[PDB]
Design a binder for this molecule. Structure first.
Ligand SMILES: Nc1nc2c(ncn2[C@@H]2O[C@H](COP(=O)(O)OP(=O)(O)NP(=O)(O)O)[C@@H](O)[C@H]2O)c(=O)[nH]1
Ligand SMILES: Nc1nc2c(ncn2[C@@H]2O[C@H](COP(=O)(O)OP(=O)(O)NP(=O)(O)O)[C@@H](O)[C@H]2O)c(=O)[nH]1
Ligand SMILES: [Mg+2]
Ligand SMILES: [Mg+2]
Lengths: 177, 177
């Protein structure tokens, strides 16, 4: 038997952001320095146990950065329980581009009459010394839109599990304490 | 609150088979005569209530027939709880081609060490008078591979809901009586 408690989590953002690295760090605990661009999308599963022995499977949709240029993106976002808006904290364009991704998220939420939880994820915090996006601006963007806030490093693993765990817990409405 | 009981159901088969029509008949009860080819894939959700007030959401992945020619297909099949192998009962090639689709299903099942339930779906039973695939052969293919057996018409709606309901119930292991 199984609850088949499965949450669709879509990971969005520019090609510099580190979406695949974040997902692979979480889903299989591994990292690669050489960039291999995701064409279209890829899919991962990882089951975690939340407090109270609450088992949940995250169905992670790792979307390719080029998809923002087409119409397939709207279909990929449809039915999401959670959305991660990922940017590279050292790359201003990756942050600026989140407006485009989030516009699509809102459009799909409006027409599907849904409301997936949205998380802003500043990746590459191992590169904090060459950070270009101010933490204050990250916070402001969260406040303006009701996003949850995360800072992570796919490379070191810093806060990656905690990010996905928090997103799952927020979707279900469970306290992490 | 919600169980978030969500099952990934992948719909596979040749471009003649009527996958999108089957999915749209189930998910929104509508039908179109003019063929509009699915590029890549599309995704649908429909929640149903099984006996005992058991609520479950089918996440239906409507795969484009052209995807068999590439490598993206393996990714789409990954993590499926159920697979529909759909053919047009009037179109021999659509039936013959199921060997190609099922080869990929088995390959993914082997490497993911999983075992999604597989259903053989003969669509277009409204065209039974021009049927080319014998029911005996459909049955034989099911027996050889342990498939569940369905005959449906996306056009008339004949047995479409029952097909998806049975697939969901078999995945969960619930008696329909
Ligand atoms: N220093 C550092 N580099 C990272 C981190 N995460 C990813 N990278 C690097 O950033 C590059 C892009 O990573 P990748 O995960 O492929 O990004 P993506 O967002 O999936 N791109 P695409 O949308 O094109 O598939 C790679 O060179 C990768 O090693 C991180 O936390 N720190
Ligand atoms: N008579 C009849 N025609 C059907 C039935 N289901 C689909 N068709 C017809 O078969 C054609 C293909 O249907 P469609 O659902 O687009 O097929 P598909 O399997 O999704 N194709 P693709 O993989 O290219 O997207 C259309 O002309 C459609 O009207 C059915 O049950 N009966
Ligand atoms: Mg990628
Ligand atoms: Mg189609």
């Amino acid at each position: 038997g199984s609850h088949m408690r499965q949450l669709k989590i879509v990971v969005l953002g520019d090609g510099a952001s580190g979406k695949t690295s974040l997902t692979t760090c979480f889903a299989q605990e591994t990292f690669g320095k050489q960039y291999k661009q995701t064409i279209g999308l890829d899919f991962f599963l990882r089951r975690i146990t939340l407090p109270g022995n609450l088992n949940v499977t995250l169905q992670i949709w790792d979307i390719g950065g080029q998809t923002i240029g087409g119409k397939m993106l709207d279909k990929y976002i449809y039915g999401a329980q959670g959305v991660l808006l990922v940017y590279d904290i050292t790359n201003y364009q990756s942050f600026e581009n989140l407006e485009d991704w989030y516009t699509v998220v809102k459009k799909v939420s409006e027409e599907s009459e849904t409301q997936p939880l949205v998380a802003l994820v500043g990746n590459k915090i191992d590169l904090e010394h060459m950070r270009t996006i101010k933490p204050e601006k990250h916070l402001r963007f969260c406040q303006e839109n009701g996003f949850s806030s995360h800072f992570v490093s796919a490379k070191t693993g810093d806060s990656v599990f905690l990010c996905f765990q928090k997103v799952a817990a927020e979707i279900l409405g469970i306290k992490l304490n």
